[PDB]
Design a protein around this nucleic acid. Structure first.
Lengths: 104, 349, 201, 220, 115
RNA sequence: GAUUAAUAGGGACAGUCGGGGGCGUCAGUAUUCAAUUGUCAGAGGUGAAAUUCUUGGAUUUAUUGAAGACUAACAACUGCGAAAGCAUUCGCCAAGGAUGUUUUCAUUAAUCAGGAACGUAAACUAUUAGGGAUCGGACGGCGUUUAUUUUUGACCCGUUCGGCACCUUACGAUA
């Protein structure tokens, strides 16, 4: 983030079974999976690199990221549900009571 | 809950980065920095249109439905409205959700989408047959690039720096008040001013980090008095084409570059300062040289009010204005406390 | 010391709820075996809904649920109903002394044809070794693809765990059934109640 | 070979630093830089090794930056008051007591050094060590100017100590005359202002309201 | 209602009724299963879990928290991933003696690949 | 002076396809070991026990760090490789399959003596004639969803090659 917090985002995304279909397996091809994962990492990088941590949590709460991944991956293969399953803060290099009290 | 899920809400304010000239109190709708600009990004969609007026009317449609939910719900002590903008020229369709909280905080709300920058690049690219629109189209694209895109990372970096540098906030307030009494802040954008005061805190050589607001203010005025802007650009830690194409500096005087902004032009040349010998910029370096000269010749005493009284010399026409105000206006509803007419200004009257 | 009494008599503040997801071939069978499930879960106090559109079984604790372990019973019940245990057995987990277990056996054999041979060796000729294991261990064993789903008392869960690992590790289940029959014969008389029984197996 | 040019750079360093050989400014001047360069060329680390960027065949850049680094970390600016001392050839770091010492002549060189100017020399040395370790921005022309001694909170004090029994709160007696060489009032206001401005947290973390202090006797 | 977090480690050999604060750091009161039963055979039994849950609920009602969030686990590395009888019996006795239950979760260590 | 261009070959190009291979890299838990706290009487095994660890605090609770291993669920009446075998992401390196082409030399080929490269177990056992599935191309299209409208992809359908496997029938057989 812009406040120099490094963090890992783990996103999960299940494939959409299209209504009015007859075939039982909704398998995406492997190249299609690689394209989906490329668009997923592109979306989460482009929409998590610009904001601070408080705006990132405010976007994580109503799941705007998974909604935009669902909206932008449906030209490659439609996805049943995209969630971000883990956020892990690795290093926080600052202790600042100014922003930490501007939160509270 | 919306048809398009929220993704990012980033206020871009000097009230976030602790550099509004007046520190906020509850209420003051008169005040300049009171409507607090906030950029907002939705999730990605392909259903935004492909023209400027249409995308902006879709934007105010989303602002209208946000304001409709806000006026419906039980926090409706919050009041809101939608209002136009002119600061981006030629985009007459820019509107905001301006929202007042019960504790008097006013917030300017604007939506960002992914196709605006590409559309303004389209406007820079097209109309090639006219052959004179590209410079002012670049001005509009980079004014957008100021107010919408770079201000988020800007307030993030100044917010993460202002805790480690604590006198920086009254120092930018004092240098900005000096620019206010010397009539320079209307052509000078504020981000250039915050970077200008920020050089003395983050590149403090050969002095210490300023542990006093007056120390930081004096270091800013002497760095301006010793800054020869011809040969020296200001590179801060929070080029070789422009002095070739502009050797007399008729277009740009200040070059303030960062790892944020590596072009050095976004807060100086984009605004379009008039810059010959007899204008705002050379007048600014002349006032700072006069400040350093007075603080050399007479010292530091109660006659430091010469730095805060303007000279009003070397101006062609001078026009004095008075506005239809009562006594103690505007100050008492700005929340600033001069003017002893407002009795009890030392208390919560 | 081991018997468990049925619950005689609001113990839930946050209204708990669980979900599991099933495919379509199970959606048919669940759609026409569901009223038994929701009847017994209404007798336990937990609302159970089925969603053929998304393919999801949900349980949720109502206002008048009093047994707090009932939500764990219901979560295991919908797990087994998703994993295609038949419906009276999945409802038989709702008794007090029963518990289920899933044994992942695909990690135990590197080869494929050897794994198929050893799984069919676990299943036996005409299912006779499997129902012999079910009799000797008082369990319900379902050799389910790459896993093995067992139900019953906790003692039987432990013995079928040992037998399934030893069957995958090339010890024969007929040998293990002979071992269990010897252990049953030795535990019948308590004259040999505490000795080391390794001198007999 | 480059001893002369290294002393030249040290004199330029000190004349912009405001320090000199005078007793009223700390006594660290050209002579103290020169004897420091001699002691560091003939030793200085804790196991009495000849110091690594201080061999006699090196350039004035290396001699100057190594005197900067040793004044910035080892035992020569703030550590020769509290945590360490030096000895002459073969020169060695000793982790006890304050002096810049010569046992062959029984003279301490830093007798003119107050702890205030010592700590000022250490923040200057640490800053110049960072400046010489900087590899992107050119750093010859920044030479430190001393707003630590002249800030905007420069407090002007007019004190008449006449007569001394009724115009000074502490007695100027025979032992104070034997100890101090007419800078007794200055060292007094130094210790008084440090004890005034020093806090003390419960968890052992020492914090003060100030980092550095200077008392200049104006019009001396 | 002060929510304390009850870790119930229900294995096949012994059950651990453990009560911590919301942090996980400061143990309030724990009673293992085997300290209430004289027999190591019957250490993991519903009677043992009932006695342990009654003692833990008595101590935590003397301290006055009267509300728990319950996290149930078992031996999960190469173990069974199913709780023993201690989980059901301890939760039954725990909410049968006071103790408005909050959020129930089965936090078993599930390996992504163990052996 | 030089045939059919084979319903046999080998090659070229294009979009591709694959849990095929090598090298690096990125993660994920779990286990063990160690440290920091809250501990405060057993813990561990077993059908019961015992050996063992346990007021210098075991097992447990929380947080970090290291090491080695492996890649759950997805995971299949599937995919790839000649075989053993092959499942974390990304990058690089060659190779291979099928399809399509408005691609070339025209018997180059088939089969294996000799030889050459890769390497604790067992234990119940010229068509058949199509159809339903399946995946890899290529083509076609009434249409739903991408799509703010064109791409393009997902779903449905038909044609066509190619391939793992099911059932029926044998076209028969035969030890």
């Amino acid at each position: 983030t812009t406040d120099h917090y490094l963090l890992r985002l783990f996103a999960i995304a299940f494939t959409k079974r299209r209504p009015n279909q007859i075939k039982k397996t909704t398998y995406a091809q492997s190249s299609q999976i690689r394209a989906i994962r490329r668009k997923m990492v592109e979306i989460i990088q482009r929409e998590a690199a610009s904001c601070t941590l408080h705006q990132l949590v405010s976007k994580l709460i109503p799941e705007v990221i998974g909604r935009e991944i669902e909206k932008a991956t449906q030209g490659i293969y439609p996805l049943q549900n995209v969630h971000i399953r883990k956020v892990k803060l690795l290093k926080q290099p600052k202790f600042d009571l100014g922003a930490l009290m501007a939160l509270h | 809950d919306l048809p398009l899920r929220i993704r990012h809400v980033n206020p871009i304010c000097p009230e976030l980065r602790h550099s509004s000239l007046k520190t906020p109190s509850f209420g003051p709708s008169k005040s300049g920095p009171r409507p607090m600009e906030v950029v907002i990004s939705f999730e990605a969609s392909g259903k935004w249109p492909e023209s400027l007026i249409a995308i902006q009317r879709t934007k105010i449609a989303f602002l209208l439905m946000i304001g409709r939910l806000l006026e419906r719900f039980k926090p409706g002590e919050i009041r809101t409205h939608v209002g136009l903008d002119d600061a981006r020229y030629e985009t007459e369709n820019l509107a905001f959700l301006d929202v007042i909280y019960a504790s008097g905080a006013c917030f300017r709300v604007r939506i960002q989408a992914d196709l605006e920058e590409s559309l303004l690049e389209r406007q820079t690219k097209d109309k090639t047959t006219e052959q004179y629109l590209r410079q002012r189209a670049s001005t509009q694209l980079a004014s957008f690039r100021r107010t919408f895109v770079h201000l988020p990372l800007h307030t993030q970096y100044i917010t993460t720096a202002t805790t480690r540098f604590p006198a920086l906030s009254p120092t930018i307030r004092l240098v900005k008040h000096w620019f206010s009494v010397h009539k320079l802040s209307n052509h000078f954008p504020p981000e250039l001013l915050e970077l200008f005061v920020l050089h003395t805190f983050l590149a403090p050589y050969p002095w210490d980090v300023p542990s006093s607001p007056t120390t930081g203010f004096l270091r800013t005025l002497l760095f301006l008095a010793r800054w020869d802007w011809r040969t020296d650009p200001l590179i801060i830690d929070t080029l070789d084409a422009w002095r070739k194409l502009d050797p007399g500096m008729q277009h740009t005087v200040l070059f303030v570059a960062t790892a944020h902004e590596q072009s050095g032009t976004m807060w100086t040349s984009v605004d379009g300062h008039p810059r010959p010998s007899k204008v705002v910029a050379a007048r600014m370096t002349a006032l700072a040289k006069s400040a350093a000269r007075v603080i050399r010749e007479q010292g530091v005493d109660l006659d430091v009010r010469r730095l805060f009284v303007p000279s009003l010399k070397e101006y062609d026409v001078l026009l004095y204005l008075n506005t239809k105000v009562l006594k103690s206006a505007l100050r008492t509803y700005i929340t600033v406390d001069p003017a002893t007419e407002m009795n009890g200004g030392k208390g919560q009257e | 010391k081991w018997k468990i009494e049925p619950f005689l008599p609001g113990p839930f503040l946050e209204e708990s709820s669980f979900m599991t997801l099933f495919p379509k071939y199970r959606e048919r069978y669940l759609k026409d075996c569901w009223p038994l499930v929701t009847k017994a879960l209404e007798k336990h106090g937990i609302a159970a809904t089925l969603d053929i559109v998304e393919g999801s079984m949900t349980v949720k604790t109502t206002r008048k649920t009093y047994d707090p372990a009932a939500i764990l019973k219901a979560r295991d019940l919908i797990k087994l109903l998703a994993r295609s245990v038949p419906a009276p057995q999945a409802l038989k987990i709702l008794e007090d002394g029963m518990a289920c277990d899933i044994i992942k056996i695909r990690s135990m054999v590197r080869n494929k044809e050897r794994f198929v041979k050893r799984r069919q060796r676990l299943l036996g000729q005409n299912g006779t070794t499997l129902k012999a294991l079910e009799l000797l261990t008082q369990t319900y064993i379902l050799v389910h693809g790459n896993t093995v789903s067992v139900m019953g008392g906790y003692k039987g869960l432990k013995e079928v765990r040992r037998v399934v690992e030893d069957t995958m590790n090339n010890i024969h289940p007929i040998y293990l059934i002979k071992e269990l029959m010897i252990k049953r014969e030795l535990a019948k008389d308590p004259a040999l109640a505490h000795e080391d029984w390794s001198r007999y197996l | 070979a480059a001893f002369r040019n290294a002393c030249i750079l040290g004199r330029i360093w000190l004349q912009q630093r405001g320090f000199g050989s005078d007793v009223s400014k700390g006594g660290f001047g050209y002579f103290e830089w020169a004897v420091l360069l001699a002691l560091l060329l003939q030793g200085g680390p804790a196991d009495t090794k000849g110091a690594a960027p201080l061999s006699p065949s090196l350039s004035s850049t290396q001699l100057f930056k190594a005197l900067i680094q040793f004044l910035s970390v080892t035992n020569f600016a703030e550590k020769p008051c509290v945590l360490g001392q030096a000895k002459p050839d073969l020169a060695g770091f000793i982790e006890n007591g304050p002096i810049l010492w010569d046992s062959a002549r029984q003279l301490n060189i830093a007798f003119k050094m107050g702890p205030w100017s010592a700590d000022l020399l250490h923040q200057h040395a640490r800053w110049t060590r960072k400046l010489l370790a900087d590899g992107a921005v050119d750093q010859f022309q920044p030479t430190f100017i001393l707003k630590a001694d002249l800030p905007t909170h420069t407090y002007d004090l007019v004190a008449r100590m006449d007569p001394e029994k009724v115009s000074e709160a502490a007695p100027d007696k025979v032992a104070h005359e034997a100890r101090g060489r007419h800078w007794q009032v200055g060292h007094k206001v130094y210790r008084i202002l440090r004890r005034a401005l020093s806090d003390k947290n419960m968890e052992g973390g020492e914090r003060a309201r100030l980092i550095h202090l200077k008392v200049s006797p104006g019009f001396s | 209602l002060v929510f304390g977090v009850a870790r119930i480690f229900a294995s096949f050999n012994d059950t651990f009724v453990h009560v911590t604060d919301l942090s996980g750091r400061e143990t309030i009161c724990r009673v293992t299963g085997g300290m209430k039963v004289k027999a190591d055979r019957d250490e993991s039994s519903p009677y043992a879990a009932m006695l342990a849950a009654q003692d833990v609920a008595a101590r935590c009602k003397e301290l006055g928290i009267t509300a728990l969030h319950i996290k149930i686990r078992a031996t999960g590395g190469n173990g069974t991933k199913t709780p023993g009888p201690g989980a059901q019996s301890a939760l039954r006795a725990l909410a049968r003696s006071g103790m408005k239950i909050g959020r129930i979760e089965d936090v078993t260590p599930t390996p992504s690949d163990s052996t």
